[PDB]
Design a protein around this ligand. Structure first.
Ligand SMILES: CC(=O)Nc1ccc(CN2CCOCC2)cc1
Length: 119
């Protein structure tokens, strides 16, 4: 990551952009498994294996409360969603496929956000 991403504080204008990025992911057709925390009734062994769970509703709460100080911290939480999914599920599962698709989409939107900060 470049120096702006790591070290430039998130301004109010930056936060409006983060809200838009998040809403785009929440509206994606392949985002359904990630919208809310993993349901322990459906996955009884999940919280024993995955030590730092993450989901898009937890990220929305954090954005609203201005939890993030630097872009790198927002990117780290998002990346945790996808990394947790690829570690827990096998490579041939529909969950794994959704992570592949949605991470690619996130990278496209994140590049757009970074461009709009510098110009
Ligand atoms: C985002 C995420 O990883 N979700 C998730 C949801 C349920 C399970 C539990 N299993 C999966 C396949 O077998 C039936 C139930 C595992 C992972």
């Amino acid at each position: 990551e470049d120096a702006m991403t790591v070290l430039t504080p998130l301004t109010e204008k930056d936060y409006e952009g983060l809200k838009r990025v998040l809403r785009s992911l929440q509206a994606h057709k392949m985002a359904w498994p990630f919208l809310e925390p993993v349901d322990p009734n459906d996955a009884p062994d999940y919280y024993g294996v995955i030590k730092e769970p993450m989901d898009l509703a937890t990220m929305e709460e954090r954005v609203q409360r201005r939890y993030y100080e630097k872009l790198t911290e927002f990117v780290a939480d998002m990346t945790k969603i996808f990394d947790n999914c690829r570690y827990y599920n096998p490579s041939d599962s529909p969950f794994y496929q959704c992570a592949e698709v949605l991470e690619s989409f996130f990278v496209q939107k994140l590049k757009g956000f970074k461009a709009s900060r510098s110009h």
